[PDB]
Design a protein around this ligand. Structure first.
Ligand SMILES: Nc1ncnc2c1ncn2[C@@H]1O[C@H](COP(=O)(O)OP(=O)(O)OP(=O)(O)O)[C@@H](O)[C@H]1O
Ligand SMILES: Nc1ncnc2c1ncn2[C@@H]1O[C@H](COP(=O)(O)OP(=O)(O)OP(=O)(O)O)[C@@H](O)[C@H]1O
Ligand SMILES: [Mg+2]
Ligand SMILES: [Mg+2]
Lengths: 167, 175, 4, 404, 145, 348, 365, 285, 34
């Protein structure tokens, strides 16, 4: 909690400022309803992208529109084992993207995970619970990765111990 | 499906919606005398082991109702025949159980009161009581010969293994 | 037409 | 030179394992897993490697037996992943990086369940290829050994039955018509419970802890299909010496012997296929009416090939006269309809009489495995497999359509 | 053959499109550098900060002017202490507050070591006498800085 | 503060009749529902279903009881009451993108529809062949129109759109209106003429809500910059802006000559003051928290308020006003109750 | 309802519905289905016509006698006036057959038979334009100049909604859900009427399909299963613009419209450009006319103007889709009956049919 | 199951069933099975010339010439005796069992027939352990290509026997997990004092293994076992041989099991996330 | 062609081996006909 609490407070305040959406039909195609951060057809409906960075390798990029918000998170990876565990975890969660309802099948380049939140999710859920879910997700990922690394090391110790014992 | 009777004749006397079929008996009363070997009691005893597993029965004619009545009373005969020890005591128990005042159609306590039709006239009530009593006594006397294994004179396992089964989830007596 |  | 592929068929009751190119499976095991009791989770050390599968999973002290597959559909994917570890590395003893694999699926399977199976095979065992096969086509292909050359086609009706529900699967030109599939709730676990209720009322001296597997041993040895019920009851009472058989067994806890009499349950067991109201109080429709209803919901031009080729499969179709009873009751059901259309129209509807033929072959017991074993021995099997290179580049969307 | 007609898009060649209301103007060269350097020379911190918040380069369409204007205000923003941040926050007015939010949110984009964490400290004090609407005015602005 | 959970779904818009006994809400689909108050309960009444799209705007006239509905299916209907049943009549719009907002005229002869095809449709009634004829106001509008309001002399119109500007047009049809008098906004008023074009150059946001006054000489609009601004036409046509520290607001209305009530994504209505010299000052939040894991925000609404309408008579004198939200509610606030409950709150 | 007192009945002989109405009415008096259900020959599943071609005339006599009976009209068969219609690319022999039926079996006093494009344009109120009409099997493009159709310029396309339904069956089969083609035609037709739409820029549509899950939704089958629809919502109606997906050689509907509208008179091209009218059951997808606007903009950019970017700005396109899509042919028939009603020689009479024989239709054409 | 086992299941079950049906007195039944094992070994159990009273078990190896150079035939003859016959076509070693002439106890011969691959491998181990026991030094090392890409080296010194495995990991995840496992194999001496010494090298051959065709790719690791006369004396040596011919497959087995455990943990966490989203509904739960 | 012809060929080869491998209380046939 050396820099984690002000980083999470800044991400929470920026996500509170960003998630203010409403319904909007398309003004170029007759009776269409599309997220404006993905289509990017009109320039007046887009907002400026913002970035919050804890250090050189941890960052959150937030882009907004009139009816859609895209949030990209880069996760701290210190070793090779944490890198491959993070890559396996993100691939595992993005294959099941139809049950999460707010997840992208492919992340934005340069980042690890990406959320896409439209106005239908803000009509179907509370906003502050969605913000607390994003903060809770960012908190839980690192604890899960560290627990997997400790479990792999303990399993390797017991597996080596049995084979060298059995001689 | 379930097995039905085939003794229906175009000039057969009817009582309510029953068929007043002739039997071979020495008990006195309104049943006509039967010349052939096959009557309704022998057909009911012949079809009892196949018919008792069925839970749905469809009425086709008037012989089916008295077939269902003898099929139920064979089961209430077997529930008393399970506890017996000799053939003569079984015959005495059938002579006891034959004169028991079982309920008729129309009275409360009859299970299939919707399918059956109640009688109207008082002499019709009297001859229906007489006909049901003589059917009960004759099928008790005929079942007591077949239930007993003769070399040991104890009730057989093959007839007393059908105690817990009920025809159409119905019982002529209360639980 | 639209003086006033 | 080339190693043969591995064929694995998973079911509710039994799992069949072997290599391709063989007539019989090498292993038939019960489909159960016994794990350590939770007694309260965190698994410090190798505590998920302490389990037993198969026949040694049944009745082990301080272990809990669990059944991961229910009605053909996998319920727990953590137990199914640990089930395939001991299949590959203990029983088959195959290196999974060198062998292609063939697996089977239930006939009504979601595409989401098909992607969960290929996640386990490609990312946890690193197989070079995988093919997930429809059970109806392989059971249809295994009946070509009995028939000769001119009638080897791929249109028919497949009746599959064992330890679950009984499916009636129509198939035309190698493609399953999935709109017309109907199922029966009576299968081989329901005959076993029906024999156990009949043996409990009559016989005495059976141990209470052994009442289930003595009912299973009576069914596999002494049961058959009677053609008529009331004539069969008359045969047993008049001549009891010919038909009543004796079964003997040994007690587990005392090592003593017990003997019982096997009577009316030899033919009352398989009769609940044709009279399901004997045991199940909710289903009243016989199997000969459901096979007629499935064909009548098919298109018109394919109905007459579907009547001519009815193929039985499964372990519960192994009774003595299952094919002759089903052929006789189907011909009464059609001729009830063909008489009723003729008398209502005044003789106007006069079609040709159809030919109904139920086909019984030798390999009915392992028909799904035998058809999958012959397919994997062909040289063209390796060109219809999903390789690991396509899974890394394209992704898990390739394991959603299985070409025939 | 023909199907290269699907290659060319005509949606940005329409006459009816949202062109910006770019009113042309210049004369923005940062605040200035010399009195900011002399204010850092004289042992003070506040007068350099209100020197730095004057004259934003909002109208010029030049990357280098915005780069040096975002260099000099960050160059004073690392050079502080820990307990003077609240005094430097409440010594300003609201226009200084949301311009400081614009410069802080521009300063997160190029991280360089512990200085980035220093900006996080500024962020919570700039949410003290500020609001969520300061971050909203950062998000929807047609003239970046 | 009387909540009533009508739904568990969002409500797009609502309207009241003259007696304040019926409401006309839309439960986020292709249907319009009417509710009737009796005893202490709200009972569902006659339902309206003609749109195959999604209804975005509903308005009810105070007199003659005609209900106009417009939606995302590029169509507009006028519903009239006869013998217990409501019957629709088609309005041709000659539109090709969408329809986003609708409001009746104060004298109930025209109605104005905003649209996503960068124009405003003014529709009037033709009884010579019995339909509704539309006219278009196009130039200069370069974006999607979001909010409309009618001046109280049946001529001028105020429009806020997505091109960061609020502008006042003069919609005047010669067949259905008389000759207008002079206004402080302007003197020459033909059809489609722009009178003024206020807006923030440089920085700016989408204008969500506009409102006129009872006198008709003051205009107010809110934006997505969390800013509220009041333009006065009498004081040489000047503008006064105010930047708030809260979340952006979606709906606004003058509640008097010198007081304005707004609401939005903060879930709480707020009050602002405008003196005669010209200064927009924040006064107080109207929903004070009560002196008393579940989140349980200390606000009577649990989600964003999208509409504020007056409930007691008209804009000349207000004592009650109403709000609808995305959580699904209808809250009636009282000024005399909020006067005694909050110390220092002085409504003018 | 003229000075002769004869009733004027406008009857549209559609594929699925036959409408019985009168002049001056926005809605007809009777809307009855044209289904003859045999009780294995009552009327009100034998169909007398399919795709605009009569295959059985006795079932026309049965259905038309059902219209002449007391249930629907009970009009005078000897002395009344009626209005008929006929689809484009119809053979003239069938027209000779139906005027033989009207003036021999029934002997009407006034019969006019015309083209539904002209009646749809008169329902719109505009005299000159082009009509793109698509139902089942056959799609017409028909230009109408002044008040008559041009036979040399009208064209046909074989792709319509049954091929879109079969392509949707193929994409749902490659998705993973098993459908028989013959048994499940109607439920996939219900899927096509429920969820399908036309994309605008196809690379943005496939990137939105591959990258995010905002297009998915759910549908419930009648047995109880629930399916999820991916990018196939825009994949099924893409066969009209790319025919090589359905393996039918030819060009798209936009190139057919451009090749029709360019090979004409030079002065007519402008009012053919501003006036395009869509009608039919297949032209009901949300998102459709903006795609045709982009296609005609791209084709006029590359073909005519070669490479001049600025000359695209001086080009006017208006695909006029009606917001009301209802029985428009009957509306045009009512308008055409209201304008014309006193002018009696525009109709053909029975007296002309004995005094001229079969060439009264040659005088009609 | 932590340790892999050395007995094949299919051979033991089939021969036990045939021997029980032969001892029961029933007539025999025909059998024809063909199957595989680890490291590309082929087995065939069949009847010779259609005779149903005799069974024959044949094993095919891809590297039987190198094992024949070190003398596996005398070891197989000394183990089996009269059951060894001439091999059939396409197979290396064949054994014949007659159902008419059988011993009284059908337990030792089935267990010896299950260990056919082990008895093929054990000859080079016994020869180099005998070279270490006799004290002779200066003989050449043994190179055995037990797989296509993997190569086994056996060398004998004056006081120790060195066994070098060269292993290839297909995927980079297996490279990282195998480095994690062999780090614990390398420093695991501190638990048990009497143990063979394990050394590990990544991407490079060891310096003793020089002037050979050793691969230097990034997916190739080298594992060195150092064995002492406590392990290579006779009364232990068989057990040592058993463990060492499992070893590589054993290592790869545990790597795959580690990945399976990770999958279980991810499933649990994914379920918890969905429950949080189910609490975000406005009374739709 | 395809896998179907090879599958027919391999069980055509196999069925002659299966039919050559297989080379009284329920003999009553007269009831089974209708
Ligand atoms: N004659 C018989 N021989 C063998 N099994 C029989 C016989 N009659 C009944 N069965 C029953 O067959 C069942 C096993 O059948 P089967 O192997 O086809 O099942 P399954 O593994 O569930 O099948 P599937 O592979 O189709 O999912 C057992 O429960 C057994 O009691
Ligand atoms: N709302 C809809 N969206 C999409 N397709 C539709 C819709 N309604 C109908 N269709 C399709 O339109 C076709 C039928 O349209 P139409 O009513 O023109 O038929 P028709 O009367 O048979 O045709 P025609 O008059 O050309 O002979 C079918 O393919 C049907 O699936
Ligand atoms: Mg099964
Ligand atoms: Mg049509």
């Amino acid at each position: 909690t050396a820099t984690l609490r002000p980083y999470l407070s800044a991400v929470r305040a920026t996500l509170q400022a960003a998630l203010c959406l409403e319904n909007f039909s398309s003004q170029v195609v007759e009776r269409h309803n599309k997220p404006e951060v993905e289509v990017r057809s009109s320039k007046e409906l887009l907002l400026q992208p913002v970035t919050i960075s804890r250090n050189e390798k941890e960052k959150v990029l937030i882009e907004g529109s009139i009816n859609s918000v895209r949030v990209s998170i880069a996760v701290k990876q210190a070793d090779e084992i944490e890198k491959i565990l993070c890559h396996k975890f993100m691939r595992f969660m993005m294959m099941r993207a139809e049950n999460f309802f707010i997840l992208r099948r492919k992340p934005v380049e340069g980042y690890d995970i990406s959320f896409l939140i439209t106005n239908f999710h803000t009509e179907q859920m509370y906003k502050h619970k969605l913000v607390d879910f994003v903060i809770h997700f960012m908190e839980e990922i690192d604890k899960e990765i560290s627990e997997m690394k400790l479990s792999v090391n303990a399993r390797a110790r017991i597996v080596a111990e049995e084979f060298l014992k059995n001689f | 499906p379930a097995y039905h009777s085939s003794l229906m004749d175009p000039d057969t006397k009817l009582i309510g919606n029953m068929a007043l079929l002739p039997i071979r008996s020495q008990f006195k009363g309104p049943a006509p005398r039967e010349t052939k070997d096959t009557d309704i009691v022998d057909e009911a005893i012949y079809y009892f082991k196949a018919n008792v597993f069925f839970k749905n029965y469809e009425i086709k004619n008037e012989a089916d109702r008295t077939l269902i009545y003898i099929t139920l009373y064979i089961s209430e005969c077997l529930k008393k025949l399970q506890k017996c020890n000799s053939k003569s005591q079984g015959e005495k128990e059938m002579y006891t159980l034959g004169i028991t005042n079982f309920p008729i159609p129309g009275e409360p306590g009859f299970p299939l009161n919707a399918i059956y039709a109640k009688p109207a006239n008082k002499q019709e009530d009297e001859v229906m009581r007489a006909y049901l009593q003589q059917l009960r006594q004759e099928t008790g006397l005929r079942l007591c010969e077949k239930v007993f294994d003769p070399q040991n004179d104890k009730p057989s396992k093959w007839w007393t293994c059908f105690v817990k089964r009920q025809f159409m989830n119905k019982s002529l007596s209360g639980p | 037409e639209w003086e006033d | 030179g080339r190693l043969p592929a591995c064929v694995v068929d998973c079911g509710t009751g039994y799992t069949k394992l072997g290599y391709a190119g063989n007539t019989e499976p090498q292993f038939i095991i019960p489909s159960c897993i016994a794990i350590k009791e939770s007694a309260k989770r965190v698994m410090k050390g190798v505590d998920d490697l302490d389990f037993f599968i198969g026949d040694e999973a049944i009745e082990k002290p301080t272990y809990a037996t669990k059944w991961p597959i229910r009605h053909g559909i996998v319920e727990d994917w953590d137990l199914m992943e640990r089930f395939m570890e001991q299949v590959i590395f203990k029983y088959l003893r195959a290196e999974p990086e060198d062998h292609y694999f063939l697996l089977t699926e239930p006939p009504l399977n979601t595409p989401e369940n098909r992607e969960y199976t290929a996640e386990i095979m490609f990312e946890s065992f690193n197989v070079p290829g995988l093919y997930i096969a429809v059970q109806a086509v392989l059971a249809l292909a295994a009946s070509w050994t009995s028939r000769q050359v001119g009638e080897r086609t791929l249109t028919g009706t497949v009746i599959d039955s064992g330890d679950g529900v009984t499916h009636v699967i129509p198939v035309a030109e190698g493609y399953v018509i999935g709109s017309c599939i109907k199922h029966i709730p009576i299968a081989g676990r329901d005959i076993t419970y029906f024999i156990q209720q009949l043996l409990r009322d009559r016989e005495v001296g059976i141990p209470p802890e052994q009442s289930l597997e003595t009912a299973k041993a009576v069914k596999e040895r002494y049961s058959y299909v009677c053609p008529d019920l009331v004539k069969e009851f008359n045969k047993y009472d008049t001549d009891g010496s010919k038909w009543i058989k004796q079964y003997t067994g040994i007690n587990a806890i005392s090592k003593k012997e017990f003997s019982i009499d096997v009577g009316y349950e030899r033919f009352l067991g398989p009769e609940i296929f044709f009279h399901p109201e004997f045991a199940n109080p909710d289903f009243t429709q016989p199997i000969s009416e459901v096979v007629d209803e499935v064909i009548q919901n098919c298109p018109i031009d394919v109905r007459r090939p579907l009547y001519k080729n009815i193929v039985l499969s499964g372990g519960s179709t192994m009774f003595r006269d299952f094919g002759r009873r089903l052929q006789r009751d189907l011909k009464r059901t059609v001729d009830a309809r063909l008489k009723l259309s003729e008398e209502l129209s005044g003789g106007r509807l006069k079609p040709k009489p159809i030919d109904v033929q139920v086909i019984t072959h030798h390999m009915q017991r392992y028909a799904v495995w035998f058809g999958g074993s012959m397919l994997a021995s062909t040289p063209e099997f390796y060109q219809v497999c999903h390789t690991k290179k396509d899974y890394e580049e394209i992704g898990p969307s390739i394991c959603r359509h299985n070409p025939v | 053959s023909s199907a290269r007609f699907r290659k060319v898009d005509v949606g940005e060649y329409d006459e009816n499109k949202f062109v910006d209301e770019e009113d042309g103007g210049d004369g923005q060269a940062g605040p200035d550098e010399g009195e900011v350097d002399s204010c850092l020379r004289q042992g003070n911190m506040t007068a350099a900060l209100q020197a730095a918040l004057k004259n934003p380069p909002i109208n010029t369409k030049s990357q280098a002017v915005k780069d040096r204007a975002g260099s000099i205000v960050l160059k004073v923003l690392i050079s502080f202490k820990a307990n003077d941040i609240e005094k430097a926050v409440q010594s300003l007015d609201k226009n200084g507050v949301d311009l400081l939010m614009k410069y802080i949110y521009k300063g997160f984009e190029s991280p360089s070591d512990n200085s980035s964490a220093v900006l996080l400290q500024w962020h919570e004090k700039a949410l003290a006498a500020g609001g969520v609407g300061s971050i909203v005015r950062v998000l929807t602005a047609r003239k970046t800085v | 503060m009387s909540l009533h959970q009508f739904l568990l779904e969002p409500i797009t818009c609502h309207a009241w009749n003259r007696d304040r006994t019926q409401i006309a809400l839309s439960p986020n689909n292709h249907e319009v529902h009417i509710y009737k108050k009796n005893g202490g309960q709200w009972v569902k009444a006659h339902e309206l279903k003609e749109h195959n799209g999604h209804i975005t705007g509903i308005d009810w006239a105070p007199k003659s009881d005609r209900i106009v509905t417009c939606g995302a299916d590029r169509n507009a209907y006028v519903w009239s009451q006869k013998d217990g049943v409501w019957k629709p009549t088609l309005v041709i719009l000659r539109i090709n993108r969408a329809a986003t907002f609708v409001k009746w005229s104060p004298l109930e002869n025209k109605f104005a529809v905003g649209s996503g095809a960068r124009l405003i449709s003014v529709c009037y009634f033709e009884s010579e062949n019995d339909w509704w004829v539309s006219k278009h106001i196009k130039k200069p509008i370069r974006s999607t129109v979001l909010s409309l309001d009618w001046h109280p002399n049946n001529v001028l119109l105020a429009a806020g759109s997505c091109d960061f500007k609020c502008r006042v047009f003069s919609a005047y049809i010669k067949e259905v209106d008389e000759k207008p008098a002079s206004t402080p906004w302007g003197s020459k008023m033909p059809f489609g003429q722009l009178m003024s074009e206020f807006g923030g150059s440089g920085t700016g946001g989408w204008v969500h809500g506009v409102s006129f006054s009872a006198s008709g000489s003051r205009l107010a609009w809110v934006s997505h910059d969390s800013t509220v601004s009041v333009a006065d036409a009498s004081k040489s046509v000047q503008v006064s802006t105010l930047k708030t520290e809260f979340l952006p607001l979606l709906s606004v209305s003058f509640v008097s000559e010198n007081s304005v009530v707004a609401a939005g994504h903060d879930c709480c209505p707020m009050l602002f003051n405008y003196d005669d010299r010209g200064c927009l000052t924040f006064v107080s939040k109207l929903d004070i928290p009560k002196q008393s894991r579940n989140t349980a925000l200390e606000t009577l609404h649990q989600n964003s308020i999208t509409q504020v309408s007056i409930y007691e008579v008209d804009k000349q004198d207000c004592r009650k006003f109403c709000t609808t939200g995305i959580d699904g509610a209808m809250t009636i606030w009282d000024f005399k109750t909020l006067e005694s409950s909050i110390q220092g709150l002085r409504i003018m | 309802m003229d000075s002769q007192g004869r009733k004027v009945v406008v009857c549209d002989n559609g594929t699925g519905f036959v409408k019985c109405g009168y002049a001056g009415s926005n809605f007809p008096e009777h809307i009855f289905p044209a289904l003859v259900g045999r009780p294995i020959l009552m009327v009100g599943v034998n169909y007398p016509m399919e795709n605009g071609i009569v295959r059985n005339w006795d079932d026309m006599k049965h259905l038309w006698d059902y219209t002449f009976g007391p249930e629907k009209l009970n009009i005078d068969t000897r002395n009344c006036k009626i209005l008929l219609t006929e689809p484009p690319m119809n053979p003239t022999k069938n027209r000779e057959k139906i005027v033989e039926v009207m003036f021999e079996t029934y002997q009407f006093s006034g019969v006019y038979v015309a083209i539904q494009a002209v009646l749809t344009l008169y329902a719109q109120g505009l005299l000159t334009g082009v009509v793109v009409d698509s139902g089942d099997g056959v799609t017409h493009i028909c230009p109408v100049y002044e008040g008559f159709s041009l036979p040399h310029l009208t064209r046909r396309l074989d792709i319509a909604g049954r091929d879109i339904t079969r392509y949707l069956i193929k994409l749902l089969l490659l998705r993973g859900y098993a459908f028989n083609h013959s048994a499940d035609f109607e439920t996939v037709r219900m899927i096509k009427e429920k969820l399908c739409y036309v994309g605008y820029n196809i690379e943005q549509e496939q990137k939105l399909a591959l990258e995010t899950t905002v297009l998915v939704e759910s549908y419930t089958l009648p047995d109880g299963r629930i399916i999820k629809v991916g990018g196939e919502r825009f994949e099924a109606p893409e066969a009209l613009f790319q025919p090589h997906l359905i393996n039918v050689e030819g060009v798209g509907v936009a190139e057919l419209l451009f090749n029709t509208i360019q090979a004409a008179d030079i002065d007519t091209r402008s009012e053919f450009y501003k006036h395009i009218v869509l009608s039919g059951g297949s032209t009901m997808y949300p998102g459709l006319p903006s795609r045709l606007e982009r296609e005609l903009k791209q084709l006029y950019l590359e073909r005519v103007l070669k490479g001049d970017v600025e000359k695209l700005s001086k080009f006017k396109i208006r695909i006029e889709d009606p917001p009301r899509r209802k029985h428009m042919v009957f509306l045009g028939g009512a308008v055409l009956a209201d304008i014309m009603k006193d002018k009696d020689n525009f109709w053909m009479t029975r007296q002309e049919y004995q005094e001229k024989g079969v060439r009264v239709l040659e005088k009609l054409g | 199951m932590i340790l892999l086992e050395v007995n094949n299941r299919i051979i033991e079950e089939t021969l036990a069933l045939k021997f029980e049906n032969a001892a029961a007195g029933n007539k025999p039944e025909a059998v024809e099975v063909t199957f595989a094992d680890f490291d590309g070994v082929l087995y065939h159990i069949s009847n010779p010339n259609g005779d149903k009273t005799k069974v024959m078990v044949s094993i095919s190896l891809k590297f039987y010439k190198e094992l024949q150079a070190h003398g596996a035939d005398e070891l197989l003859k000394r183990v089996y005796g009269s059951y060894l016959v001439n091999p059939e076509s396409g197979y290396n070693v064949s054994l014949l069992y007659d159902l008419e002439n059988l011993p009284a106890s059908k337990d030792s011969i089935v267990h010896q027939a299950g260990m056919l691959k082990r008895n093929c491998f054990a000859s080079v181990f016994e020869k180099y352990f005998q070279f270490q026991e006799e004290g002779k030094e200066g003989e050449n090392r043994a190179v055995i290509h037990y797989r296509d890409d993997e190569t086994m080296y056996v060398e004998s010194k004056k006081d120790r026997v060195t066994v070098v495995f060269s292993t290839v990991f297909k995927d980079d995840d297996d490279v990282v997990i195998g480095k994690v496992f062999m780090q614990e194999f390398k420093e695991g001496r501190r638990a048990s004092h009497t143990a063979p010494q394990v050394l590990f090298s990544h991407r490079e051959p060891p310096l003793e293994l020089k002037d050979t065709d050793a691969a230097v790719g990034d997916n190739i690791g080298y594992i060195t076992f150092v064995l002492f006369p406590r392990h290579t004396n006779a009364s232990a040596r068989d057990n040592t041989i058993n463990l060492i011919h499992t070893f590589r497959d054993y290592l790869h087995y545990h790597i795959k099991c580690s990945k399976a455990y990770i999958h279980t943990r991810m499933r649990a966490k994914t379920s918890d996330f969905l429950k949080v989203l189910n609490r975000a509904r406005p009374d739709a739960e």
